[PDB]
Design brief:
Number of domains of chain A: 2
Largest interface: A-B, 54 and 51 residues
CATH superfamily of the largest domain in chain A: Creatinase/methionine aminopeptidase superfamily
Largest sheet of chain A: 6 strands, mixed
Number of helices of chain A: 15
Strand order of the largest sheet of chain A: 6-5-4-3-7-8
Radius of gyration of chain A: 24 Å
CATH topology of the largest domain in chain A: Creatine Amidinohydrolase
Distance between the termini of chain A: 44 Å
Helix content of chain A: 25-40%
CATH class of the largest domain in chain A: Alpha Beta
Number of strands of chain A: 17
Strand content of chain A: 5-15%
Bound molecules: proline, manganese (II) ion, hydroxide ion
Oligomer: homodimer
Chain lengths: 468, 455
């Protein structure tokens, strides 16, 4: 059948991918006892937006649930799925201008109609109930926009059934979806290598962000970054602003960037010395995060409770920080005092898919854990095959977190100021891989240099094939 | 005083630019007979947005009127200006920098937190708050009026400000022109790099990518001014041998735009037909720039470009008959359906093209003009004539006996799928003529030498 493709070396994505998602959603809804016969799923695609009151266009990016179901890149559409038969209808704006037939062929749907006819067409199809999308995103706190059209009031509308079901479908990636996520990770990994090869003392961080974006777009067809790429919030107020810090000798760099292809995300972080040679201290902190990274990846398999992996990373960080002489005392005591969250205040990792922070981390019955570090986890679910997660432990030296710990009698004793003082302004190490949960373990999607020797080799311009 | 700067070779933009804008706005309001003494201008800045219901951030870009007045890059702010004294107060979110930090950074008279805006304005006992509401004549959208908790307690006027701040934006200060010269410099350089890099077989988005990379990495231009048009949402058309490329792209620096279009043969060599069409647009481009000066009516420039295009198309054999008669039948709009050019500034399609008293001309071509004003010094415009071979426009003309007679179908057939040529320059009106901001290869000889890798 047809496939989405941007030519050259970019990935051909069969539109069958979305047909399989529609099939899976219908199969789930058919097994749902509360779904009436003759129900129709109604999704509304995104519309083009402009900057405020101007006619300056904002680059259009399809709404994620609508993309997941249909793969449609055009703004202003609606999409309908008959639950009982699986029949799909795309509604496109009545505006070279393409025919309805052109869109039917392009997207391999069963029917195409114009948007202004949606009320007439649905009336004629006599559905029992329209199933629309409404629910809460547990990362943004926002409520998903329910589809609406002139005349929808004449129909029976249920806005509670669909959201948890289509979320759960998105949580489990198909083999076709994995092929795209492998590709996004391949291009983003190559871009990360290019950045490590290009970085020079004296460069502005945004020069590297630009290079990353150029690699992803020109060689990967990735028009969008998946998320705001982190290399300043400080100097200009938003993560999106150019990071205009000058890279200095002795710096540890952290680049957190990932491109998006056809609305499938990647999210990768590399940490490395600006000048291409790890100091003893840098090697020590870095290899601590490498150790937790690898321990978690080695422990992940179906049935594993994700918060247990976060705690495992914490324990390893604390062990290694103690082996460095930054911390002293009982590691068990440190864990009881939640000392790990001083060095890693964020969650270990999160679902990834069409969204960087993908849906379904906190379905009904799954509770957020009200402890330092863990409260920042974007899911507290148990791992199952088909999930895609980031694994992103880090160690940070953040003054106000350290000072707070030093002011806390329950924590302050564990800290050796004489050694710690040398790590003030050390910076940050984070190692972020993307992985798939398999039937028995994981598959690593990311492919960047990770050991000290591999990183130093990459920055010295060694061919990627070279291995130390 | 302080300046915006992204280091390396990027431009230092004095925050004094925005101070001057505020003063200019107050000077204008003070002359407005409806403006009450003790009025305060209230502007609301943009806020951070996310993609739909996700936590995926959308790259923040400041609202244009608010940027013009304050140069503030942070989301979630307000800014007010005492009309009588010119005193400026910035309101920032309480979140980490001090208010003192923001005062120093933006060279405003006072900084407060946003949650105190009602209390602060109340203490200053204004007659009325002047808020922003009006219609953008390019989008049809209504400007969003500032609002805050407790604003209901104030007398608010939302009619006075818009036309007055729009009018200020129409006329660029020397400091603004410095930034627009810079954005044109970098975008010009990026266009040259694109011309050097184009190879048959490439995808258009590869050149869009290169352009953005040059502007960002070398210019500190994070944003494209507008969605990039890459003729021959990624443009994934393969550049083919024999194609005429059209690349319309411009970077933005600190919310100051640029808008440049280059047309050139994909394979680096103009055919006779391509040279003929291209040099027709070069001729109208140069004729319009030459004729521009204070007092010139912009629609006359549009019709000048039409006349020249028709003359050249007749010379080529595409058309026959009286060019006078052709103009009377609006034949120019078949080949150039859009307006000749538009105001440019903080927005690519900048404000103020149709203030009250200036009417849109209801004729083909001219109705798409984004201004029908007379030119005055300080105005910044694009000059972007083009010739297009658009089947449905051509078909409509061939069906209409008043136009069909002028067209030589046997010659036109050859130009079906020719594509299109547009040449877009950015210029400023001076006391005597114009200053050209754009600096790219333009003659056939310059373009071919550039693409051949010469120099
Ligand atoms: O938001 C999150 O979950 C991770 C934490 C570090 C940056 N991204
Ligand atoms: O919108 C305008 O007015 C010009 C002409 C077409 C491309 N930009
Ligand atoms: Mn990340
Ligand atoms: Mn992440
Ligand atoms: Mn343009
Ligand atoms: Mn333009
Ligand atoms: O991340
Ligand atoms: O343009």
């Amino acid at each position: 059948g047809p496939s989405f493709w941007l030519g050259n070396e970019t990935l051909k994505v069969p539109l069958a991918l979305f047909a399989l998602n529609r099939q899976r959603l219908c199969e789930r809804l058919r097994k749902n006892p509360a779904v009436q016969a003759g129900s129709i799923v109604v999704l509304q695609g995104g519309e083009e937006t402009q900057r405020y009151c101007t006619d300056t266009g904002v680059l259009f990016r399809q709404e994620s649930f609508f993309h997941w179901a249909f793969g449609v890149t055009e703004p202003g559409c609606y999409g309908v799925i008959d639950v009982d038969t699986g029949k799909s209808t795309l509604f496109v704006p009545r505006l070279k201008i393409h025919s309805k037939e052109h869109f039917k062929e392009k997207y391999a749907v069963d029917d195409v109609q114009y948007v202004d006819e949606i009320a007439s067409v649905l009336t004629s199809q006599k559905p029992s109930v329209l199933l629309t999308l409404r629910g809460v995103n547990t990362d943004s706190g926002s409520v998903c926009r329910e589809a609406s059209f002139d005349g929808i009031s004449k129909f029976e509308v249920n806005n509670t059934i669909l959201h948890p079901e289509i979320v759960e479908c998105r949580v489990f990636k198909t083999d076709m979806e994995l092929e795209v996520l492998r590709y996004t990770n391949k291009i983003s990994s190559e871009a990360h290598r290019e950045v490590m090869k290009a970085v020079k003392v004296g460069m502005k961080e945004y020069e590297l962000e630009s290079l990353f974006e150029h690699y992803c777009y020109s060689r990967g067809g990735m028009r969008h970054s998946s998320y705001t790429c982190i290399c300043a919030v400080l100097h200009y107020g938003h993560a999106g602003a150019p990071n205009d810090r000058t890279i200095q000798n002795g710096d540890m760099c952290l680049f957190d960037m990932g491109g998006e292809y056809y609305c499938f995300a990647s999210d990768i972080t590399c940490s490395f010395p600006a000048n291409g040679k790890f100091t003893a201290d840098q090697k020590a902190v870095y290899e601590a995060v490498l150790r937790s990274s690898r321990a978690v990846m080695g422990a992940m398999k179906p049935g594993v409770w994700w918060p247990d992996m976060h705690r495992l990373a914490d324990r390893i960080h604390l062990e290694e920080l103690a082996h460095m002489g930054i911390l002293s005392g009982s590691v068990d005591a440190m864990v009881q005092a939640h000392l790990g969250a001083v060095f890693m205040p964020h969650g270990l990792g999160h679902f990834l898919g069409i969204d960087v922070h993908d849906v379904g981390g906190y379905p009904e019955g799954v509770e957020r854990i009200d402890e330092p570090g863990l409260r920042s986890l974007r899911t507290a679910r148990h791992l199952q095959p088909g999930m895609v997660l980031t694994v992103e432990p880090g160690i940070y030296f953040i003054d106000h977190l350290l000072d707070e710990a030093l002011a806390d009698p329950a924590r302050a004793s564990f800290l050796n100021r004489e050694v710690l003082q040398r790590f003030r302004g050390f910076g940050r190490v984070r190692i972020e891989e993307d992985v798939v949960v398999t039937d028995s373990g994981i598959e690593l999607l990311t492919c960047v240099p990770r050991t000290v020797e591999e990183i130093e080799a990459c920055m010295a311009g060694c061919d990627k094939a070279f291995t130390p």
